[PDB]
Design a protein around this nucleic acid. Structure first.
Ligand SMILES: [Cl-]
Ligand SMILES: [Cl-]
Ligand SMILES: [Cl-]
Ligand SMILES: [Cl-]
Ligand SMILES: [Mn+2]
Ligand SMILES: [Mn+2]
Ligand SMILES: [Mn+2]
Ligand SMILES: [Mn+2]
Ligand SMILES: [Mn+2]
Ligand SMILES: [Mn+2]
Lengths: 103, 78, 97, 99, 94, 105, 98, 83
DNA sequence: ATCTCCAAATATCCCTTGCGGATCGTAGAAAAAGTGTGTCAAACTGCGCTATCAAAGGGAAACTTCAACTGAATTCAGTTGAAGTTTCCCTTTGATAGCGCAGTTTGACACACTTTTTCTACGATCCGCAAGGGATATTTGGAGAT
DNA sequence: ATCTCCAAATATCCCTTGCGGATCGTAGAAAAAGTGTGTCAAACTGCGCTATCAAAGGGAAACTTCAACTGAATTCAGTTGAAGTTTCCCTTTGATAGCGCAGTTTGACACACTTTTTCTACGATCCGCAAGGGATATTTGGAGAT
């Protein structure tokens, strides 16, 4: 498999098939699906790494939507990348505006 | 049906938003704002449904509509 | 015993900002959707997950809008959100003219 | 047999593997997996759409790892992009070696 | 090299609408931008619609529901009728 | 009638639009009526803007249309304004508008 | 000697600028700022004259619209004077960050 | 010669004119630096993308289209300079 | 009320520029003509799953009681931003000499892709079992009254 | 400040179910092969972008004066929140009724591709001439002052 030859867990063949069926361009070079598969892998690795700790902090061995929401929103860059996305069942970061609090 | 979205329901929503005190006229505004929101999303969703010559509104139909309005939703088929 | 005004409300904020449960009763919300759908196309069915999709999106939207509305209220030295606040939030969002 | 109930297709397993590599003792719910599948499909589409435009803008008939790369620079914020360009470039380097 | 533009057509539609009115260079560049933009927005959605329904071809149908999705109500009713009217007449030939 | 536009009773170039759809990778195949419909819709929209910008030009005692006219036309029209709600017309300026509270009293 | 009350010239200034469409930021200064920023991303870049023009048209339209919203935020707070916190409220609701 | 502090070229009167077209009648003295900051972040985001299109085309001259394509990416389409 | 008067508007002479209408030779693309070739509309079909029926309770929605404290209005003054003036900085305008570099051009060919056979990763389906649900108890963090 | 009461957090333990590891068949990725064209390099170039300047003067900068806006301080009618009573319907459990979504199979034909012919539309160069924006003087609407 091309993934192995590339040291990736993500399907380089599938990504290549999807790049050809999506009508992105008349042709797709050989390195494009590899490069894309690697990026996709990195980003999901990045999310799971933080969602996992959220699950840990919340004392749970299983990552649930709420954890992915905390990982995303407490992370500046992931929050930017998903600024227009809504994670179902994610809720919101606990946050009360100072002036609302009692002295 | 618009009244189905009850006052206490609107309070909880505003609470998640972090609202502490709510003027009494907010409930009617929210109902008006929710209706416009649903109308827009459902309008586009039903357009996809008809284009596919179907009579059943699918989750994907809704997700595609939510993506058109710039409100991409994760969890139902993205 | 009586908790002072704001105290229970503040309590409620902490409670809901810690859970992910939908806050609008399901059946009511479903009727609204069908009524609205009906005004654009008669004779229509809905996959159960379709209605749920709309609710997730509808609530995430209202919740975020209240966050904006609340800031505007606060912007005006107030602690009580009002229509003018919701209206200002939507006007700046570009949701309104 | 004969009438097979179609056949969906997701990133669920490649996801689960990655989850093991970073959190060996951490599991994942069906809903969260659905969210992860959406994220991957979403990112893929965003990246290819750009590369596609890059290709067109530059009157080229092909989407190479070069269009994937700058599409990544346009789509991803600061640090995430730098790293992503690291993993992609590395994958391509390694992959070509393997003969 | 050559440089395509909708200029000639835009002048044409302008004369039908305001026979004694001209348009400046910059205003035409804007008009050309408008056309290339709306085209992009329409072809783009039609593209998605076809993909969503596992189709290999973009037909006047995908262009139609793409027009209903993109244009604000009213501008769409009219575009839809000018569109349907043009295809109806066109098919009436060959 | 030779040209497809001629056949469709259109000013906009059906032939160019069909080619643009094909060279844009939107789908592997493009139906015969797709570019007629799209050319009719594009022709319609520019007629609507030229019309409105044309009236704006006459209001400013003008015979020629410039960006400002297209801007006034677009922003004074609820539908076009929404269609171009996220577009900026170079050299269009803004609509004359002063919040009340700012007016002398 | 004659003196208009404060705010009278402000109003005619709003009418003067709302009637016209010419760029309001000096041309060379804007261009230098553009070249300084690009240079921090890459060195030895050159710009077409129109590329800078486009940037200035986009920047001024952006700022003009930010000030409109900023004013609405000031007015919402019962003021008539825009302040940093009005711009901040405006950018926060717009989802603009950094 | 090294380029420094050019955000200052964006003078007080120029920012004032902008606020007028935007209908503002009274301006706090703290607005000018707030605007320079905001404008800077804005040009940084757009220019960053304009330069990425340039570098990808293997060019050294940022073109009107790189800017136009960059603005479109940021959800701020511009009419009048191509595309 | 009634006059002084500042800046936008109005009006006259001058002229250069950009625009609508021409007239022209032509590269390149649309059309007309031939014909391969696969996408898709129809058509009978199976079953997933959407709608619907019926009875009961429980907790959420609604209504009521009471007054805490928040929003709106009034008065007031140090603050600070607008208006106008004076000075002269450095943008704007205009012609320029020099080359960096964007963009057309042309043949070698590495590289993507189509067709086909083989090998196999990953999807549909399963079920024990443990993480999480959920109910009752003990502890812990705070608010509100004395 | 300190002391009694509420509710959330936390500990405890038994039930529920969806995680997550297995099994089995297969749709799709891979392998060896024969094919051509989009891509890359090398050579040629003139549009135009950078650096520069020389005189003009338009506009920025900085300071004085003070009008009036911001906002601190105070007030109190009453809109809201909290807690208790009353009224209502959403949620949940056991499944039939059958709608209409989706699998299968298929061949006419709509659309792709190719080659030749017809012609549209763009680049270069000329024209009647009103649209037009600047240099310069006068009239006009009304903000501000006697
Ligand atoms: Cl490649
Ligand atoms: Cl209000
Ligand atoms: Cl068609
Ligand atoms: Cl401030
Ligand atoms: Mn620098
Ligand atoms: Mn104890
Ligand atoms: Mn599972
Ligand atoms: Mn001056
Ligand atoms: Mn049936
Ligand atoms: Mn008078």
């Amino acid at each position: 498999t091309r993934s192995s030859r590339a040291g990736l867990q993500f399907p380089v063949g599938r990504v290549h098939r999807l790049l050809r069926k999506g009508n992105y361009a008349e042709r797709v070079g050989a390195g494009a699906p590899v490069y894309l598969a690697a990026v996709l892998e990195y980003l999901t690795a990045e999310i799971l790494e933080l969602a996992g700790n959220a699950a840990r902090d919340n004392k749970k061995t299983r990552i649930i939507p709420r954890h992915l929401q905390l990982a995303v929103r407490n992370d500046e860059e992931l929050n930017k990348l998903l600024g227009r996305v809504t994670i179902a069942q994610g809720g919101v970061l606990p946050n009360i505006q100072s002036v609302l609090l009692p002295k | 049906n618009i009244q189905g979205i009850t006052k206490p329901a609107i309070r909880r929503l505003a609470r998640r938003g972090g609202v502490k005190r709510i003027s009494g006229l907010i409930y009617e505004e929210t109902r008006g704002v929710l209706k416009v929101f649903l109308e827009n999303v459902i309008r586009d969703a039903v357009t996809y449904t008809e284009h596919a010559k179907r009579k059943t509104v699918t989750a994907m139909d809704v997700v595609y509509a939510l993506k058109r309005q710039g409100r991409t939703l994760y969890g139902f088929g993205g | 015993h009586r908790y002072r005004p704001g105290t229970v409300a503040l309590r409620e904020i902490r409670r809901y900002q810690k859970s992910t449960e939908l806050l609008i009763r399901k059946l009511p919300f479903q009727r609204l959707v069908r009524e609205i759908a009906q005004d654009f196309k008669t004779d229509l069915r809905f996959q159960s997950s379709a209605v749920m999709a709309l609710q997730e999106a509808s609530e995430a939207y209202l919740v975020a809008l209240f966050e904006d509305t609340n800031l505007c209220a606060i912007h005006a030295k107030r602690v009580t959100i009002m229509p003018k606040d919701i209206q200002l939030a939507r006007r700046i969002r570009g949701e309104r003219a | 047999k004969k009438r097979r109930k179609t056949r969906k297709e997701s990133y669920a397993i490649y996801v689960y593997k990655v989850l093991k590599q970073v959190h060996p003792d951490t599991g994942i719910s069906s809903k969260a997996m659905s969210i992860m599948n959406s994220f991957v499909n979403d990112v893929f589409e965003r990246i290819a759409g750009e590369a596609s435009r890059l290709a067109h803008y530059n009157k080229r008939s092909t989407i190479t790892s070069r269009e994937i790369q700058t599409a990544v620079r346009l789509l991803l914020p600061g640090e995430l992009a730098k790293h992503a360009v690291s993993e992609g470039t590395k994958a391509v380097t390694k992959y070509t070696s393997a003969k």
